[PDB]
Amino acid sequence: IVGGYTCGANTVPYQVSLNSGYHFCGGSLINSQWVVSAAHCYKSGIQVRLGEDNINVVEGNEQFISASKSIVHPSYNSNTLNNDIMLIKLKSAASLNSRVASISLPTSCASAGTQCLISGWGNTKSSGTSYPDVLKCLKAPILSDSSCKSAYPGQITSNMFCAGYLEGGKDSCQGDSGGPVVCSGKLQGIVSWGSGCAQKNKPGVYTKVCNYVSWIKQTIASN
Ligand SMILES: NC(=[NH2+])c1ccc2[nH]c(-c3cc(CC[NH3+])cc(-c4ccccc4)c3[O-])nc2c1
Numbered sequence: 001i002v003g004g005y006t007c008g009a010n011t012v013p014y015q016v017s018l019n020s021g022y023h024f025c026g027g028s029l030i031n032s033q034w035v036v037s038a039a040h041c042y043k044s045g046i047q048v049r050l051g052e053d054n055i056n057v058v059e060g061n062e063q064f065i066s067a068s069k070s071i072v073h074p075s076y077n078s079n080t081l082n083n084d085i086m087l088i089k090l091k092s093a094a095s096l097n098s099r100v101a102s103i104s105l106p107t108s109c110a111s112a113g114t115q116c117l118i119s120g121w122g123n124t125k126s127s128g129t130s131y132p133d134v135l136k137c138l139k140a141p142i143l144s145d146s147s148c149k150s151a152y153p154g155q156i157t158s159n160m161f162c163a164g165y166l167e168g169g170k171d172s173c174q175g176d177s178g179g180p181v182v183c184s185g186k187l188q189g190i191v192s193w194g195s196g197c198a199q200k201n202k203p204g205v206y207t208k209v210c211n212y213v214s215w216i217k218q219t220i221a222s223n
């Protein structure tokens, strides 16, 4: 997260860290046994780490659980990143409390101007790499589809939306991929891609979760 602030320990209880010997992507807990992340974060050997703040120090509240299976959307396109969503089923259910809790799926899509909270342990530098130990937060608005398509002509599908600042300086970045974009208590987006990080007129692009709620429910119900 570039231009954000320190969230504060366990203030984003649905945020998870996908780990393979190091933090490589974020995710969101949607129930005690399932996590939603981005398809491009897929790899084998994933350990889901819940209740984290400092990902380099066991401070208490952490729950490390292996993923039993990862389900990448069948229509995920790695070249356009269209349908960049994946579901991860945990080997055992997580113990939910105040520090570890799930976030609700939306019943309707959000409108432009909606203010959302984006969080993660990704790069905090737009020009260089600086990865944080604790969780960073950024409040950002959803931009209009016209501004988004104007910024990324021919690359935005109906399953994506832009959020952020056109002036640059505040944005999600590498390492934040797969993590949550929560607006009015509902998971509306998944950090997916962008051109650089926090560059002027190149806002972040997010997977539009409201377009996948029935797919998520049907997939969870049959697995
Ligand atoms: N500006 C943004 N809002 C933004 C958001 C998410 C991003 N994710 C990435 C990203 C970049 C790379 C390096 C490509 N030269 C790799 C990954 C990546 C992470 C895990 C697995 C595979 C790729 C990214 O998510 N850049 C990103 C930029």
Ligand SMILES: [Ca+2]
Pocket (backbone or CB within 6 Å): 052, 053, 054, 055, 056, 057, 058, 059, 060, 062
């Ligand atoms: Ca920790």
